[PDB]
Design a binder for this molecule. Structure first.
Ligand SMILES: Nc1ncnc2c1ncn2[C@@H]1O[C@H](COP(=O)(O)OP(=O)(O)NP(=O)(O)O)[C@@H](O)[C@H]1O
Ligand SMILES: [Mg+2]
Length: 331
């Protein structure tokens, strides 16, 4: 059985709502938008030269295409027959981009959004094993926890765009109350920030995309250590404005529900492990990049004890890195 031992390719796939991140046991590492773009008509199909395009270029060309994000920002929920085919196209493309050899047995751990129903995880598993030889579908917080060697007595706070997903890891299948989903996340910050800015600078030409740019450049919580000065437009002209306090307000607005959620999950652990849980509060997702976040949360958790809050080092790739590790380590 030399062939079978040698001709094996492992993949860690972070199959997210907005982005798919992939690492392979041979060192491939790449990122793409979780989107497939289809020609609008037969002429589009001729123009495209292929039946669909996948990833960043699908997004880039979206004005000319019918684009589909198969992990409809939830899961929201039951994935249709049509969207399972869209997911097949996405996963087929990511697996091809990992460049397997023609003799390779492709073995993939595929992380999916936390709230994906059992039925949807089963659907994605069936589809996956039509694309790769062996697959295992796991939830995102598990994959993230696994990569940190944090699978028990841990709480993962995953701050995304549409939701903040908070998961207690207890070394078992999550119970119904081991997860909390908040609707206050990055998009909500954008909205708050847009409006905090316009209150102070009504003349700026502003939308949630501009607010998002300001946020991504300057996000912080706690006492300001620098000035958030951003170069806006007003009546067509460049105008710089200090939006330190709007940024502070908008980013800090996320935190009360997060702290409340951590409390709710903390008390569901056995009492003698609660201090240990507080040493394993992990922030993930795009929102974990907010400046000052770990210290701020640590201070806000003082009523519960002395917390060690950490932010994942690389929100983009740490999930798929963990999935790859699971894939290579599992017998
Ligand atoms: N430095 C930053 N500071 C604050 N927010 C940021 C930063 N970088 C990215 N974000 C935000 O993080 C969010 C994206 O996080 P991400 O974890 O990629 O979302 P997602 O889970 O894929 N999307 P969704 O399922 O719709 O919630 C967006 O709101 C970004 O604007
Ligand atoms: Mg997310």
């Amino acid at each position: 059985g030399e062939g079978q031992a040698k001709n094996r390719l492992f993949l860690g796939v972070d199959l997210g709502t907005s982005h798919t991140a992939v690492m392979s046991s041979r060192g491939k590492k790449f990122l793409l938008k979780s989107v497939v773009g289809y020609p609008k008509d037969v002429i589009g199909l001729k123009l495209l030269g292929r039946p669909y395009v996948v990833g960043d270029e699908a997004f880039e060309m979206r004005s000319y295409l019918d684009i589909r994000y198969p992990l409809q920002d939830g899961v929201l929920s039951e994935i249709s027959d049509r969207d399972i085919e869209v997911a097949r196209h996405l996963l087929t493309h990511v697996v091809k981009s990992a460049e397997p050899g023609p003799n390779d047995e492709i073995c993939a751990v595929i992380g999916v959004p936390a709230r994906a129903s059992a039925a949807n995880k089963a659907l994605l598993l069936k589809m996956a094993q039509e694309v790769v030889h062996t697959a295992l579908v796991v939830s995102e917080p598990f994959m993230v926890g696994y990569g940190l060697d944090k699978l028990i007595n841990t709480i993962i706070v995953d701050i995304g765009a549409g939701t903040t997903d908070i998961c207690a890891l207890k070394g078992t299948v999550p119970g119904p109350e081991d997860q909390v989903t908040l609707t206050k996340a990055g998009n909500y910050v954008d909205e708050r920030l847009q409006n905090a800015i316009l209150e102070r600078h009504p003349e700026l030409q502003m939308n949630v995309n501009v607010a998002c740019a300001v946020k991504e450049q300057f996000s912080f919580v706690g006492t300001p250590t620098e000035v958030a000065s951003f170069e806006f437009r007003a009546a067509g002209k460049p105008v710089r404005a200090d939006v330190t306090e709007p940024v502070k307000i908008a980013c800090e607005a996320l935190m009360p529900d997060i702290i409340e959620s951590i409390e709710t999950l903390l008390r569901s652990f056995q009492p003698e492990y609660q201090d240990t849980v507080l040493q394993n509060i992990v922030f993930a997702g795009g929102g974990s990049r907010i400046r000052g976040l770990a210290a701020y949360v640590k201070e806000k958790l003082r009523p519960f004890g002395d917390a060690n809050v950490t932010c994942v080092k690389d929100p983009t790739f740490d999930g798929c890195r963990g999935a790859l590790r699971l894939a290579e380590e599992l017998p």
